[PDB]
Amino acid sequence: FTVMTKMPGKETADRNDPYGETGFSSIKWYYGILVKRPERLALIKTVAPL
Amino acid sequence: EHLSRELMNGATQITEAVLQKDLLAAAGTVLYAGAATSDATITGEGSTPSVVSYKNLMRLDQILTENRTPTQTTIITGSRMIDTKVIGATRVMYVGSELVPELKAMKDLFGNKAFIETQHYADAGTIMNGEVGSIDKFRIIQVPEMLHWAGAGAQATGANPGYRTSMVSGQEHYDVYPMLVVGDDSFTSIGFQTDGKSLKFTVMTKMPGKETADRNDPYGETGFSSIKWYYGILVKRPERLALIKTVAPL
Amino acid sequence: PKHYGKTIKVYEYVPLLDDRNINDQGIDASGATIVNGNLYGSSKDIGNITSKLPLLTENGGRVNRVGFTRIAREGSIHKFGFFYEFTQESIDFDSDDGLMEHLSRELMNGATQITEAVLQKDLLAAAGTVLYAGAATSDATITGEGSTPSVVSYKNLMRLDQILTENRTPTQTTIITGSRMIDTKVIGATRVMYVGSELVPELKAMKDLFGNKAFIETQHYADAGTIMNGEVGSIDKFRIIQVPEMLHWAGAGAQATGANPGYRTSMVSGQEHYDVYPMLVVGDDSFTSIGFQTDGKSLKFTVMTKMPGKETADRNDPYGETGFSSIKWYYGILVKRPERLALIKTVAPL
Amino acid sequence: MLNYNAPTDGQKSSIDGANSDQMQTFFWLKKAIITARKEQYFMPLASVTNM
Amino acid sequence: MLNYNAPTDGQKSSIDGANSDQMQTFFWLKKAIITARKEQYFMPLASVTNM
Amino acid sequence: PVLKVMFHKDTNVATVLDASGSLSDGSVEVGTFHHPDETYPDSVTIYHGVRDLLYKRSAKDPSQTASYPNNIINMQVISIDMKATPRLILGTALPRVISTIEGKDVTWHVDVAGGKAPLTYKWQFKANTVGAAFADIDSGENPTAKTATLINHAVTAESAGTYKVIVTDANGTTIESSSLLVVGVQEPPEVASIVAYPSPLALSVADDITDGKTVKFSSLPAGSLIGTLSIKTQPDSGKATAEISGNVLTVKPVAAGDTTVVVTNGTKEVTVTVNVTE
Amino acid sequence: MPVLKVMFHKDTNVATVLDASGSLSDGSVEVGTFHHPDETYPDSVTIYHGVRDLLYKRSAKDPSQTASYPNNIINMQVISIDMKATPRLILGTALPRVISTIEGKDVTWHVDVAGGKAPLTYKWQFKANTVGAAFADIDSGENPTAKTATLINHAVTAESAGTYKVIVTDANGTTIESSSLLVVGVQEPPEVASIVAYPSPLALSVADDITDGKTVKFSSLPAGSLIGTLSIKTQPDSGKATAEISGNVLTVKPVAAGDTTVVVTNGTKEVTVTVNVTE
């Protein structure tokens, strides 16, 4: 996870918000898998009781 | 790295082209080859085509002497090597690659070869950067990026004997090519915040990350790179900028 | 290297101001999306350049955005080889006990000659700067008769040098400024050109733009400058090197008739056609040879020999009377800068 | 016969099936081809007056 | 904006022209997948008499 | 193509023939094979094909089949006589991509060897639009489409696409090559001026009163869109009359003396001086 | 890339993204249009990047008019985006790139598609591995599964080998497609090792079977071997029964009580049918 945070103040003062009253926090990542032997993943599909 | 190098190369080329265009437009001493009196009359066909001649160069030198444009080079009085020639050229002329063969085929007043190649006088005098030879009064410098006026001449037809043309409004017209002499004190560059230089590039680069993370992009996925500058010239002595307008062979 | 197929690929990065720079990144000085992102490209027209200048105001903004591009070049290798066979009797009963030495020497000489010919043919086919003599526009229009035969002239050499200067092909030699020996001449040549024996007389009869002899023999400047191997003289900007095995396109020109003033021709499909001869310039960094398992050489010969005896006694020859010797190799080139390979095509005198 | 064939031309090697191909059909020469900066002849001619 | 796009899916990157594409669109895992030898149950049961 | 192979027992001569060929020298038919190979076109050849065919025939009698070691396998004594049509080979292939700009002429050239002469050439074009298929380039307006060399004068943005050439020999065997054409397009520069030619316009009342004379207009720089022209200021009606159609002004004399016509595209103006003589 | 309109209310600072045929009568001004699945970078940008680009060219004092920086709409934190256009169509479950099978096995393809405007229609096509073959609609009448999301090609032969393509369309006519190569692996038929007759023995009654007789069917072993052309090598005793063979079926008719045999051959293998005739 990559976390970016910018608190209110000089760090967010800009022509859009000259006073720098807002901040933000974001999180992002990359993910994926490679399936080598799909036949070794077994699955049963069924209904379930209430 | 490739992109930054290409950006800087483009910037320098653009500045060179702009300065050249300004110098060409600022010329006060303009001479038209053949019988042409304006750009629209520059023609490669007919009985008197607008091709630069030896007498045109002689008259350009005459005009530059009448208005007292200072000379740039000293004459070469010869060396002791065999097959070397003395050179009386005292001025510097800038031409494009398109005109060089035309200047090499030029005849003098007696019908002989007017163009002198650098090897005939390289031993006695210094060869300038980009020089291709000399004609009676001018030492010819070939400029790789010499500009021209595409399709600014007369209308070309099937009678075109082999001069370059450009398509204008669906019709073919002759190109006009410059032969430029840049006299001393003719112009100066206006240097604003350039620290004594004629130009100064300001390059701003922001890479993706927390530098570009913003209310408009909380993730900072994008960056940019920009280049900017100021430029201007002051033309002091427009008559010291001499120009010859002519067609060029294919 | 091994296990990468037979091909080599390389990137070429185009400059911003270039007509090959086709991209969709363009935004003009008013902020509008535009079809081209290379500004004015390779244009030299003053009017076009002025309209596309990246002008900027005090407000800044998203104006004058540009893009870039790159190209991929490629080349590949190919397989070659040949062999010959002999019997035991051809060795034992032959008068010359040194026959096999002769045969092996001739095999290797032939192999080297073939590799040289193949490289020359590839270089000739890969030329990006091709010039046709006379008024010809292709091989089939190269003619030795008519009102304007396709014979190399002073202007063709001038134009070839001009083109090589515009595309910035580096020069290969420096000018010779003369000597104090009487009867010597100064040489302005800066490039090296390769021609065959058949064209040299035509070059030696060439006239400059004013009717004087254009060809300068080496003795006239050998005192002041080094003479290159195979050099015969200089014309204008080129120092002429005579290649003993220069190749030509036999019968590739236009049809030849009784009007032929004396140029070379070949019979093609029962019909007479003019021969086309090359004048080749090999610029620096124009190409490279692909060396597969050649230990840094452009080529490597593998020789396989089996002599008569038990080494060749087999189900097919129970007596072991026959032997063989073979040669094989790989070769290929990668053309990096095709415009730096210049070529003039012309007819040649008989 | 197991043949290399010509994978770059769409002719697969014998070892590769309908759902396989050569991983490395070419070698990448990592040194790129670049052009040099164009020359300038008029910029050196300009004198500078400070603004 | 110069975008990577999806070269593997036929969407060229902004930097690649008609003559160019990505030299490396994937990473090759050189440790291959193989299947083990099938088991034998009757061969161990066999005694041998010399012929 | 399918190549028939004939074998002569007494001379160990294997003759390769077209599918329809035949011999009457006592040779027996041993089989046929595809050349070039359908799956490995450039990995085997006629020697391998003949060897494979001969491997499955008896050495005692080539008419009958046999297995090893009673088959013909010693190729060292087998002479292969080639009488079939030579393989069609593409000598000079087209450049996979060609890049240019609008208004440039583009040439494609192909060299083909082998096959049964005479060869025929047919060029095809496929536009970049979705679902566009190859269509023959009509050889009528463009004669070069029938030859090995194709020339397209003044290409445009609509010329961009894939160009393919199909070469067929006398036996109907086909070989083709393709190239992609990329046409660089740039925004047309804005009109910086309009040029009139001739200007001045000389008229004679005696000679020009019926038909008048014409002035043509062009834009600078060349290739800029001149737009719609109109007369902003008419000439003096006592000296001349003027009408404009497209980029052509027609001026008719009325009486001797000088006048002017001002033509505009709405953003730029050009004055035509008109000199009228008796 | 369906084109989407964008309209902007200057007081609420609300950007409504609508369909090209769509409209809003709330005081919103059209600010432009943009292809949503972008036509060059379909997965590198979204609606946000399109609204941000259309609003940069419009004035922050009157969105109906155009403007340049620094007087354009460029703070998107204050701007909302109200989507009222059809959602983008998304292949959630694509087809495998290649399915490998053997002859006689049933194959099943299945696509899952999200977004679009209901109802989503489906159309399966097939291209042959033959030369100059073009995609052609699978008969949705013969195979009723070719009009659904799951195609089922039962008992695939070598002729089945080739490219299958599904085309999913929304109520607006927007499409999206997926393709799969089928490889149908083929093995030489085993040689016939024997012919099997059933029933054998054949029981006949003179009273019941004299008109129509009874039939014996033949099969090859192993299963899937080519039985070839069958013929009677040895007829039954004509005083007990008569026999005729057509294809792989022997018909035997009783004549009188008692046992007999029929020998059937394919030219390489033989099978004897015992025939027991009762009164």
Numbering used by the authors:
A (entry chain I): 352 to 401
B (entry chain C): 152 to 401
C (entry chain D): 52 to 401
D (entry chain C), E (entry chain H): 1 to 51
F (entry chain L): 2 to 279
G (entry chain K): 1 to 279
From the paper:
Coliphage N4 is a representative species of the Schitoviridae family of bacteriophages. The most commonly isolated and well-studied group of phages is the order Caudoviricetes, or tailed phages. These phages have an icosahedron-based head containing the dsDNA genome, formed from copies of a major capsid protein (MCP) that adopts the HK97-like fold. Often, these capsids have exterior ‘decoration’ proteins that stabilise the capsid and/or perform other functions, such as host adhesion or bacterial hitchhiking. Structural analysis of the major capsid proteins (MCPs) and decoration proteins (gp56 and gp17) of phage N4 reveals a pattern of interactions across the capsid that are mediated by structurally homologous domains of gp17.
The N4 capsid was solved using cryo-EM to a final resolution of 2.45 Å. The three unique positions of gp17, hereafter referred to as gp17α, gp17β and gp17γ, were identified to bind around quasi-2-fold axes of symmetry. Gp17 forms three beta-strand-rich Ig-like domains, labelled DI-DIII, from the N-terminus to the C-terminus, separated by a flexible linker. Interestingly, coliphage N4 decorations bind horizontally to the MCP–MCP interfaces. The DIII domain differs considerably in orientation between gp17α and the other two chains due to a bend in the DII–DIII linker by about 130°. Chain α binds the pentamers in the region of the highest curvature, while chains β and γ bind about just one of two unique quasi-2-fold axes near the three-fold axis at the sites of lowest curvature. We propose that a consistent binding pattern benefits the capsid stability by ensuring a copy of gp17 DI is present to reinforce every quasi-3-fold axis of the capsid. The minimal capsid contact formed by DIII implies that this domain has an uncertain, non-structural function that seems to be similar to Ig-like domains observed in other phages.
